[PDB]
């Protein structure tokens with residue numbers, strides 16, 4: 001059983017995983033496979049990896065106790081992208097676009 005605010009969070013999560021946003025959301029679907037992508041410095045730079053499949057598992061397991069906790073993981077995911085990558089990288093442009101979707105809908109949280 002999810003609170004009203006956590007149902008809004010679950011709605012946002014479903015939207016971020018939906019075909020509507022797939023053109024720029026796909027790098028965030030699964031944990032970064034550093035070894036597969038040849039990013040051998042990734043886990044030296046990013047101490048707390050996060051991705052939408054991990055957010056989905058935590059939501060399904062009722063790990064998040066409130067909207068703030070959910071938003072902290074979604075923002076951690078974007079912050080990791082902005083920390084690791086040069087600001088002109090294609091993946092950063094995709095992060096910016098998905099974060100715009102997130103922030104504008106998160107701002108419509110019911111009181």
Ligand SMILES: Cn1cc(-c2cc(C(=O)NC3CC3)cc(Cc3ccccc3)n2)nn1
Nearest residue numbers: 027028032037080081084085086089090091
């Ligand atoms: C979530 N995530 C993925 C990546 C990442 C980082 C790199 C990368 O080589 N970064 C430079 C700094 C060393 C490459 C890719 C693959 C790729 C390429 C073009 C467009 C979307 C994805 N994804 N970062 N964070």
